[PDB]
C-alpha cells in the first residue's frame, strides 16, 4: 500500500515528495490538513518512514538554524509554491555578501531541505516592501501612523475604531503577512478610547500645532 | 531490543547519539519529550546505560562547571543545533585569552561532553548584542529606558501597558532569550497604575499635578 492511497478519497490536497535521505514528505497546505495527514502516520499504517511538512512550520524551522549560523542577515520569506524548487526572498540594500558567498548560502540551505532540488535566491528590493504596505494601508482609508527607523518600519493604528475599520485592517494585515512576513514591517492595531484616531494637537496663540507621536493619549470627553 | 524502537512510533523527535564513555544519549528538545523519554529509562525496559540530554539542562550544567575552574569569563550561550559539534558563543571585547588558551578551553569543553566530536568556539562582537535588543524593541512601539553600565546593559519598561503591549513584549523577550541568553542584556518589565487619568497637570521644566482644585503635587525628578 502506497502512501497516496492511505489518505482520503480526494487525492489532490496532499502531494507526496520523495526525499534524499530515504524518506517521504507529505506536503499539506494548512493546519487542518496537517493533523489529517499526521493522524495516518501516528496510528501507524505505513511500514516506511514519512514526515508531514508545511509552509509555516517549515519557515520557523529553517530560521532557527539561520539565526545561529548566519546571524545579522536580512531576509523576508521562503516561498513553497513549487515544493521541489523553493524561492528565498533575500534583501538587497542591507546585505554585503558577494556572488561566491551566495552560492555557499544556497548550498547550505539546500542541505537543510532534503525534499528540494535547488533553492533559488532572489534579491528583492527594500523600498517597494514599504511602498506596498503604505499604498495598501491608504487604499482602505485607515488612520495610520508611519514610524521609519533603521532596519524596519512600523505602522500604528489606534483610537476608538468601528467594526468596519477593524475588519478591514485584519483583512489587509493577514493578506500582507502571507506575502512579505513580519520581519521588516509590523502593524500595531490597538483599541483605546479617544474619538481622535491617534493624532493629537495643542492650541496656542496662532492655531493648532501637530504634536509628535508619544505614548500618552488624551481620553475623550464627548 | 534497541533503544530507538523503545521510544514512540514517530522516529523523528528523538536522536540517539553514541557516547565515548560507553553510554547512549537521547537528545530531546523540550521538557515534554524529556519526561517522555525519561519514563522509558526509569521504568527499566533497557539493559545498558542511557541518559536523556536537553538543550537547557546541558546549558546550565557546563555553566556550573565553568564558574569554578574558569571564573571571570564573558560568554553568551552554547548552541546545540548540530549536537555532534556545538558552537560556543564567546565574547570578543571583554576577555583577552590567546590562541593557546582558546585551544585549552576547547579541549576542556570537549572532555565534558562525550557525544561531541569537537567544540567550535566563536568570538562575537559586543555592540550588536545590544543593538539587536534595542532595534527590536523600538520596532514594537514599547516605552523603554536603557541603562548602560560596565559589563552588561539593562532595559526598563514601565508604565500602564495594555494587553497588546504586554503580549508584544513577552513574545520579543522570549524570542531574544533563545538566541542570546540572559548573560549580557537584561530586560525588566514592571507595570503600575497611572496617577493622571482625570487629573490636570503641567509638563515641561516646572511640572506639577493637580489632584483637586486646591491640591498641588510636585514630583521630584
Amino acid at each position: 500500500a502506497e502512501l497516496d492511497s492511505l489518505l482520503g478519497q480526494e487525492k489532490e490536497r496532499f502531494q507526496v515528495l520523495p526525499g534524499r535521505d530515504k524518506m517521504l514528505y507529505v506536503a499539506a497546505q494548512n493546519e487542518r490538513d496537517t493533523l489529517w495527514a499526521r493522524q495516518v502516520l501516528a496510528r501507524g499504517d505505513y511500514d516506511k518512514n514519512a514526515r508531514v511538512i508545511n509552509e509555516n512550520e517549515e519557515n520557523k524551522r529553517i530560521s532557527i538554524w539561520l539565526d545561529t549560523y548566519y546571524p545579522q542577515l536580512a531576509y523576508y520569506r521562503i516561498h513553497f509554491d513549487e515544493p521541489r524548487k523553493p524561492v528565498f526572498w533575500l534583501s538587497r540594500q542591507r546585505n554585503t555578501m558577494s556572488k561566491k558567498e551566495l552560492e555557499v548560502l544556497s548550498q547550505k540551505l539546500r542541505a537543510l531541505m532534503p525534499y528540494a532540488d535547488s533553492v533559488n535566491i532572489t534579491l528583492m528590493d527594500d523600498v517597494t516592501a514599504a511602498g506596498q504596505a503604505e499604498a495598501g494601508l491608504k487604499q482602505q482609508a485607515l488612520p495610520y501612523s508611519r514610524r521609519n527607523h533603521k532596519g524596519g518600519v512600523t505602522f500604528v493604528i489606534q483610537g476608538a475604531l468601528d467594526d468596519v475599520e477593524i475588519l478591514r485592517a485584519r483583512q489587509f494585515v493577514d493578506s500582507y503577512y502571507r506575502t512579505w512576513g513580519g520581519r521588516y514591517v509590523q502593524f500595531a492595531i490597538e483599541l483605546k478610547d479617544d474619538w481622535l484616531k491617534g493624532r493629537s494637537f495643542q492650541y496656542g496663540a496662532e492655531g493648532y500645532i501637530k504634536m509628535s507621536p508619544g505614548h500618552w493619549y488624551f481620553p475623550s470627553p464627548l | 531490543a534497541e533503544l530507538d524502537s523503545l521510544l514512540g512510533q514517530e522516529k523523528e523527535r528523538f536522536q540517539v547519539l553514541p557516547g565515548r564513555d560507553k553510554m547512549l544519549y537521547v537528545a530531546a528538545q523540550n521538557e515534554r519529550d524529556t519526561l517522555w523519554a525519561r519514563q522509558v529509562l526509569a521504568r527499566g525496559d533497557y539493559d545498558k546505560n542511557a541518559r536523556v540530554i536537553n538543550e537547557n539542562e546541558e546549558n546550565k550544567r557546563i555553566s556550573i562547571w565553568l564558574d569554578t575552574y574558569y571564573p571571570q569569563l564573558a560568554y553568551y550561550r552554547i548552541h546545540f543545533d548540530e549536537p555532534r559539534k556545538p558552537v560556543f558563543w564567546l565574547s570578543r571585547q571583554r576577555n583577552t585569552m590567546s590562541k593557546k588558551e582558546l585551544e585549552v578551553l576547547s579541549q576542556k569543553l570537549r572532555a565534558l561532553m562525550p557525544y561531541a566530536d569537537s567544540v567550535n568556539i566563536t568570538l562575537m562582537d559586543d555592540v550588536t548584542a545590544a543593538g539587536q535588543a534595542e532595534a527590536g524593541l523600538k520596532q514594537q512601539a514599547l516605552p523603554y529606558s536603557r541603562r548602560n553600565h560596565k559589563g552588561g546593559v539593562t532595559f526598563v519598561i514601565q508604565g500602564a501597558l495594555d494587553d497588546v503591549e504586554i503580549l508584544r513584549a513577552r513574545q520579543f523577550v522570549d524570542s531574544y532569550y533563545r538566541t542570546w541568553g540572559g548573560r549580557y542584556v537584561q530586560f525588566a518589565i514592571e507595570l503600575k497604575d497611572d496617577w493622571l487619568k482625570g487629573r490636570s497637570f503641567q509638563y515641561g521644566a516646572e511640572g506639577y499635578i493637580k489632584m483637586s482644585p486646591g491640591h498641588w503635587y510636585f514630583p521630584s525628578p
Binding site: - | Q202, Y203, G204
Partner: peptide, 26 residues
Amino acid sequence: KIPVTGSGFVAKDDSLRTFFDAMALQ
C-alpha cells in the same frame, strides 16, 4: 511619572480660575 514629550498645560474640565493660574507664570 508624567509622560509627555513637549511642554504645555493639559486641562481636563478646569474652571477658568485654576486655568489662568497656570498662565500666571508665563
